[PDB]
Amino acid sequence: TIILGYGHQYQANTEIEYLSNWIVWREAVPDSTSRHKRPPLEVLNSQCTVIAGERKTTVLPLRVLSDLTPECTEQAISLKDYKFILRGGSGGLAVQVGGAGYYDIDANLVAKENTLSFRGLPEEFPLTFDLSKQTQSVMLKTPDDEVPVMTITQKGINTLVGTAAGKDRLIGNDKDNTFHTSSGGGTVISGGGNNRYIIPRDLKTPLTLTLSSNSVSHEIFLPETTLAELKPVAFELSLIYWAGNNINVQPEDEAKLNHFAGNFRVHTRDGMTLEAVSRENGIQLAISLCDVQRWQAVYPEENNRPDAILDRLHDMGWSLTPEVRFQGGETQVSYDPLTRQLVYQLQARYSEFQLAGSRHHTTAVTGTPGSRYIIMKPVTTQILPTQIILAGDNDHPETIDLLEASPVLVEGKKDKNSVILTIATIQYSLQLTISGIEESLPETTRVAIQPQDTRLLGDVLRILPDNGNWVGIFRSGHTPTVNRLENLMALNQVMTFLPRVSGSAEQVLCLENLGGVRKKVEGELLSGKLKGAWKAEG
C-alpha cells in the first residue's frame, strides 16, 4: 500500500538583510517594491512516479476532492495538472484516484486484475468513464463552467469501480471486465468477453445494463439482495425488485436475446443462482443452484431441507432448471423437475441419513458403506415411491431402519434383483424400493422392523416368492413389541433396567427360555409397575 502526496520542488529566492540594530546579517525575502523580483517561493516540478514490484500494490493518493465544498473544489482545481506515473507489476495494480491530477497508469497485461476505483470522489458525483478509451478526462461541474479536474491515461485496466452513490455511465472494454457499480443507478455498457457485475441494494435510479453484441457471458452479483425481493417476471432478463428501483437489463439488439441462454448467471446473497435458460418461446430466469449454507445463514428459523426449499421456491412462482444442484450440506442433492425425481448422493461413511418421501417427487438415496437410512413416518396420503441404493462391501453392511416409521403392516415383493417393500401405518402407507449397485442385494444389510426384531436382508430375500406376489412380513398383532429380550441363560441378579419412554407409555419385557426344563424366575421389582402378563392376541 502506497499513500501519495502532492509534493513540488521549490526554489526559495532570498536576499541578505543588514540588521544594523543587532549588527548582524540575516537571510530575508526579496523586496517586492524594488521593481519586480522573483517570488519568494517558486514551483519547479509537479510530478510523482511509482514503479510497482512483483506483488499486488495499492496506490492511494491524498484525497483532495472529497466533497463539493468550495474550498475543496478550489484545491482540486489548483492541483489539476499534477502528474502521477504509476507502473504496475505482475501481481496487479489497484489505483484509487485522489480526485485531481494527470494519472498515467501503466498496468501489466499479465496481471489477473487491475483496478481503477473512483470511490474517493464525492459520494453523489456524476461519473462517466469508458474503458475502451486510452485517454479520458473527468469533468467537474463548477458554477457556470466545466473544468477537467482529472485526466486519466490507462492501459490494462479491467476492474472499474464506480463512485459511492452517483449516477454513473460506465462503458467496458472488449476484454473481461468487473463492474463495482455505485448505489445511484445510471447506465452500464459492457463490451466483449466475460463481464462480472456487483450491484448494491437500494438503487436511487434504475440501473440499465446494455449487452454488447461481442459479449459472451455475464455474471451478476447481488451481495446485499436476497431472492425474496425479486419479482419473478417471465420472458425478461431484467431483475425487478419487489420494493425499490430495479435493474433494467436490455441487449444491444433484441433479436439476439436468446444468445444469453446459460451465459447469464445471477447470484444472490441468500444462495440462489438464477440462470437464463431458453424456454419454448423466449428466455426465462429459473433457479439453478442453492447454496444451503447461505440459505441457513439468511433463514435459520425455517426448516432446511431440499424438499422444503423446493416447495417454498415453487410457492413464489419460480421456474426450475432441468438440473437443480443443492451444494453444501452433508449430501449433494440434485433435482430433475421434468421427471420429478430427487437424488441424494451420500458421501461419508457410517452416516445417519433420514429418508422421507413427499407428494411431489420420488426420493432416491445412493448410499455408502456403513451408512444407516432411517425411514421417516408417513404423514400424508399419496406419498410417491422411494428408493434406496445399497453399497455393499460385506464388511461394513448398511442398516435400513423402520423403527421411527411406526409400521403396522409391512409387505415385500421381488423383481429384477430389487426388493420392493410397502410400509403402512395405522392410516397411511409408503412404498420403498431397496436395490443394489451391482445388480445383487447385499445379504448382510440389516432391516430393523422392531427394536428387538432385526432381520438380515439375506434372510428376508428367502421367504419372498420370485413372482411379484406380496407376502406378509410383519403385523402389529401376534406377540407385542418387545423392548428387551432377556434370556433366562443369565443366572442370578441381572438388574434388568428398562428406561422410561414418554411417547409410547408402554414397556414390554420378554423372558425367554430355550432350555428343556421348566424355569422359575424369582423376581423382585424395585421401581415401576407391571400390568400383568400378556396372554393372547386380542
Added chain:
Amino acid sequence: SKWSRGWLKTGTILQTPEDRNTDVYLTTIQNNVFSRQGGGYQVYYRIDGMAGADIADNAPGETRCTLRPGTCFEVTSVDERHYEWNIIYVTLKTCGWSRNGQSKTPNGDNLFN
C-alpha cells in the same frame, strides 16, 4: 465428523470445553449410551480417575455423573485399530489444573458432545 489418522499421540494433554457439564456414564451395557448414534467417527473414552466428579440426581436405574468444565485429561494409548469401522478407542486419566490442551480436533469439531 472427521478424524485424522494418528493426530492424537499418547501423553497429549486433553481437556473438556467450556460447556455447562460433560456427562459421564459408569454403566453402558443397557443404559444404551455406547450404541452407535449419529454419523462420523465414534470415540469411546475411559476416564480412569473419577474422584471429584459430582453425581447427578439419578432416576432409579441409571448411573450418570457430571464433569466440571475445563478439567485436565492425560491421553493414554490411543488405539485406532478399528479406524476403517469408524470406531476410535481412547483411554484417559484425570490430572490437575494444568491449563493446556485442546477440546477440538485439528479440523475443529468439538469433543465431548
